[PDB]
Amino acid sequence: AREITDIKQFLELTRRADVKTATVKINKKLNKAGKPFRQTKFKVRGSSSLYTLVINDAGKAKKLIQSLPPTLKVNRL
Amino acid sequence: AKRTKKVGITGKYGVRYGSSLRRQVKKLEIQQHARYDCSFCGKKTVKRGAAGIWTCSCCKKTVAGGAYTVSTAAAATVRSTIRRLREMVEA
Amino acid sequence: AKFLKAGKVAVVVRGRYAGKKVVIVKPHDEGSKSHPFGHALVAGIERYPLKVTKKHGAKKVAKRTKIKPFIKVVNYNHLLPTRYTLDVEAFKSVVSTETFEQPSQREEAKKVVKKAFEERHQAGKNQWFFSKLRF
Amino acid sequence: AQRVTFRRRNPYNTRSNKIKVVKTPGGILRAQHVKKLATRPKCGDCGSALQGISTLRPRQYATVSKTHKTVSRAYGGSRCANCVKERIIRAFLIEEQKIVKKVVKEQTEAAK
Amino acid sequence: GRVIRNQRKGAGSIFTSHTRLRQGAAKLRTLDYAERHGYIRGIVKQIVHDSGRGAPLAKVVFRDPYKYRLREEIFIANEGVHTGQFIYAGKKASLNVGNVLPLGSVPEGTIVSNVEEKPGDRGALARASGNYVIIIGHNPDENKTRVRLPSGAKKVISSDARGVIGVIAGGGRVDKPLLKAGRAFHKYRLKRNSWPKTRGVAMNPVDHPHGGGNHQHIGKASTISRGAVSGQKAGLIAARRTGLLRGSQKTQ
RNA sequence: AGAACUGGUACGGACAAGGGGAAUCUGACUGUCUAAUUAAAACAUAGCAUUGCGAUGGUCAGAAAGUGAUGUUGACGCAAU
RNA sequence: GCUUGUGACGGCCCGUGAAAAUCCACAGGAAGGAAUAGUUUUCAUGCCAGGUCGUACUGAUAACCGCAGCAGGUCUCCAAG
RNA sequence: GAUGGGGAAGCUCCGUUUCAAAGGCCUGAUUUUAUGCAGGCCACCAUCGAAAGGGAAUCCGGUUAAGAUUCCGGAACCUGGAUAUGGAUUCUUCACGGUAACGUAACUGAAUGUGGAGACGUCGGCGCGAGCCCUGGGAGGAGUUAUCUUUUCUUCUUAAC
């Protein structure tokens, strides 16, 4: 579906009582004219749409991945 | 540079259709495709679309007229007859 | 001479309030830094009061005689000046330069105009102004 | 160069059978059917296309929100600004002259 | 013998009019109380080209007085009318080109068109391009009026029948030679199946009475009596004078 | 477009691709037909002229009809030549 | 550069070159409505269902029609160096 | 092409809105009214008839001995219906901004009337886009290698929404 780029609202739709599954994807991409980095994508499967949240810095990944509720069945990689 | 001597627009028909028929056709197509002045805006923007319909490109004012002329000579006096006949009703 | 006075009644031909009459509160012939032209400060109304009859009674009369005003800056080129005049001796200091922007304080301007026009609509005062224009 | 074929069952090219060839992810050229083009809505008075209104097929207009179907003017999605602007002029001035017609009539007949 | 091309046009199999692109009949507004006692304000929205007609049409809208709606009317556009013109219909209508009035309401010298044979058929006479009928005298007694038809015939009709002032646009159309066969084909592709015409002398005796013979000659007398029978009315029908008529125009 | 050189003077090298002129008879031309022996100076075509008809009509159809074709027409039109 | 789509145009006409279902919008003001909350399901989200019929292959000097697997005929999209 | 009709001994023929009183429809009644009833109402006026005419909505990857835009996976949109959750609206009770063309996800609204789309000739050139064609660098594979060729061919792709 579409893509949303806000952290705070993203957690709201995780426990929105309609999301059953979610997936996380890792990509090793390039940037600018320098050395590459670690890139990750967080995907959430809704009832009629497939939301996503791309993050190009693994620094913010830690505090978010722990914030996922245990009741959410996550397909790691 | 006058490219063609005497046939102009009707020269597109080649050599066929005689000389008088082309010439008589030639006369009408000159004013059929010509540019007329508009009575509502006064511009050189009156052209013929369809048989006897004269439209103005600007202000979209379409005037009904002759098949090949905005105002045919056989009917220019018709409104002159009516207009001269109107005033006797009042005075 | 200059007939775009501070009590003049005009009609708006451009913008959201297209076809709704207004009253000129303050004219600006020399313009300003903002709106560098002949803008005019009007206080006209957006919703016209519906027609009332002898059969109407009590609450069905009060709701019909409801008026939703508005205050807006309009250029002279979007107005239709008339010879009509509306009594505006109430609200000199209501509509002014500071009345616009920070729309929180714009609200009370739209309130005093409504009540003032509510009083002026009762009885046969300015019947033409409060009649909806057919167009 | 790869060559494509029809996906529907009609073998003839018409306005309802327009074909655009697209580069499919699988590495092959696939024919993609295009729907017929939309036409701009037109003013009822001047006939010209009116701006500010979304252009789409007729039946599909039932899904778009009103923000693309109604400008905040009088005669919103039927007339276009200038036609409305002079419609106010024609209405205001003729009624203005009508009372002028009435006042002269009340004076001439009274002095008759 | 055989049925003839003139006989075969009665069954109407392939001779029907090509009435697909024709907007509609150009009949006048039906007479009503608002018309025979007063005048109605009305305006034409656009003028359109009809198929098979050399005269432009006019789409005039008349506000229904009985009910809240609009009625469109198809009028033959008299030359000199324009879109947005106020076309007036009724007794009290002024004398201007485009208005329709009964013949009894107009003084001597006026030429009109689309007049009614009877009071209410909504116009039968002088409907082609460039035609008009002249007012050549009134008959107040027994409410008649006689007029000059475009063919020169003088006919007397009721003063109550309506007619629209002015000549019809599209006149002078036949002054242009038709030149090509295709131009004739294009003209006749929308009117009827009456083109091209094959001479009866060329064909066989079965196909036409003129047919047969070792040469291209008619045979017996070509002129056919009016009291003849269908099947042989394929020549000069009740001809009065043949050859080049001599003398000037404007005959009595 | 031009200048030198060069090739047993070969060079649109294969394919591709107008014979031309003085006239005579006749149909003006484009076009059409005897699908299975006649493509024609035959038919058709624009042009010219004549005839009938103002609808309670002119021409034509039907066994009648409260039926039709021209006609969703009007003499600069329809119909017959 | 070829195929194709689209836009503003220009030329042509005594040819100016389809209808309806359907969908939407505007004028109008009926009717109802406040805050102790009434609308808002032509705003975002959530729930359910989408019935019947066809879907294989040829489409042509062997799958169709010409008694046959008969040099005949049969509509169309893509098309490189 | 069926009714109402008119012919015809008749099989049937004419017309199909024309000499037919030809229909359903929203508000209200509710609380035996089931749906009747009391008013506002509108009048269209059988049916058939073009899997290349108009037409609401989807694609990609893969999978059979023979199927796929139909099956598997993933990702969409439309229509009919029921119900809430969230947002906007409001004691200026049915929104604001911009001078304006107009915009902001929402941002009352019937009978009736009007307007737009559907809806659209052919030819000629021009502008722009896509598919393909030509080609440089680089990352791999295959071919030649008596002699020469930083050489030849090939993969480098992205959908509906």
Q: What is the DSSP string of A23-61?
A: EEEEE----TTS----EEEEEEE-SS-EEEEEES-THHH
**B61 Cβ under 8 Å from any chain E Cβ:** yes
List chain F nucleotides near protein: any atom < 7 Å from a Cβ. Answer: 28-30, 42-56, 58-61, 68-81
Distance, CA of E39 to CA of E90 (rounded, Å): 4
Q: Residues of B with CB below 8 A from E82's CB?
A: 40, 61-64
Whether CB of D28 is under 7 Å from strand G: the answer is no
- Nucleic strand F under 7 Å from the C-beta of E14: no
Q: How many CB atoms lie within 10 A of CB E145?
A: 23
Residues whose CB is less than 8 angstroms from the CB of residue C12 and which lie 6 or more positions away in sequence, other chains included: C18, C19, C20, C21, C22, C42, C44, C74, C78, C79, C80
Contacts of E166 in chain B (CB under 8 A): 78-79, 82
Please name the amino acid found at residue E20.
R
> What is the resolution in angstroms?
3.2
Q: For residue E132, which residues of chain B lie inside 8 Å, CB to CB?
A: 78
Q: Are E and A touching by the rule of 3+ CB pairs within 8 Å? A: no
CA atoms of E76 and E54, how far apart (whole Å) = 10
C110 — phi, psi (to 5°)? -75, -10
Assess whether D3 (CB) lies less than 7 A from strand H: no
What is the rounded distance in angstroms from the CA atom of residue B74 to the CA atom of residue E167?
10
Instruction: Quote the CA–CA distance of A21 and A43 in Å, as a whole number.
Output: 9
- Residues D61-77, buried b or exposed e (16+ Cβ, 10 A)? eeeeeeeeeebebbbbb
| CA–CA separation, E172 and B68 (whole Å) | 8
Q: Say if E181 is an interface residue toward chain B (CB within 8 Å).
A: no
Long-range contacts of A1-9 (CB under 8 A, 24+ apart): A1/A46, A1/A49, A1/A50, A1/A51, A1/A52, A2/A49, A2/A51, A3/A51, A3/A52, A3/A53, A3/A54, A4/A51, A4/A52, A4/A53, A5/A53, A5/A54, A7/A53, A7/A60, A7/A64
Beta strands in chain B (DSSP E): 46-48, 53-56, 63-64
Which 3-state string (H, E, C) describes E153-204? CEEEEECCCEEEECCECCCCHHHCCCCCHHHHHHHHCCCCCCCCCCCCCCCC
Single-letter amino acid code for the residue at E195: W
- Nucleotide H52: nearest residue by CA–C1'? D12
How many angstroms separate the CA atoms of E171 and B28, rounded? 13
D/C touch flag: 3 or more CB pairs below 8 Å: yes
Query: Measured between alpha carbons, how far is residue B48 from residues B44, D53, E53, E173 in Å?
Result: 12, 33, 16, 13
Query: How many other C-beta atoms lie within 10 A of the C-beta of residue C35?
Result: 13
Torsional class of A24: left (φ above 0), alpha (ψ -120 to 50), beta (otherwise): beta
Phi, psi angles (nearest 5°) of residue D67: -60, -25
What residues in B contact E80, CB-CB < 8 Å?
A: 63-65, 75, 78-79
Chain D interface includes C15 (CB < 8 A): yes
Residue in the structure block whose two tokens are 């013109």:
E85
C74 CA, H103 C1': Å apart: 18
Pairing verdict, β C68-69 and C45-47: antiparallel
- The CA distances from residue E11 to B61, E6, E185, E191, E237, in Å, are 45, 11, 23, 17, 21
Q: Which of E122, E121, E92, E125 is nearest to E111 (CA)?
A: E125
3-class secondary structure, E144:
strand
- Residue E194's alpha-carbon distances to A7, B16, C66, E17, E197, in angstroms, are 81, 26, 71, 11, 7
Q: Provide the token pair at A5.
A: 């780029």
Phi, psi of B88 (to 5 degrees): -65, -25
Taking CA atoms, D108 is separated from B90, D100, D111, E110, in Å, by 19, 13, 5, 34
Helix (H), strand (E) at residue E138: strand E133-139
- Listed residue (E114, E120, E152) closest to E136, CA to CA: E152
* Helical segments of C28-91, H only: 59-62
The position carrying tokens 């701006």 is: D51
Whether any strand H atom is under 7 angstroms from the Cβ of C56: the reply reads no
Q: H or E stretch including E61?
A: strand E57-63
CA C81 to chain centre: 13
- Tokens (6 digits) for E79: 């030359």
Contacting B residues, span 21-50, partner chain E, CB-CB under 8 Å:
21, 24-25, 28, 40, 49-50
State both tokens at E174: 């036949």
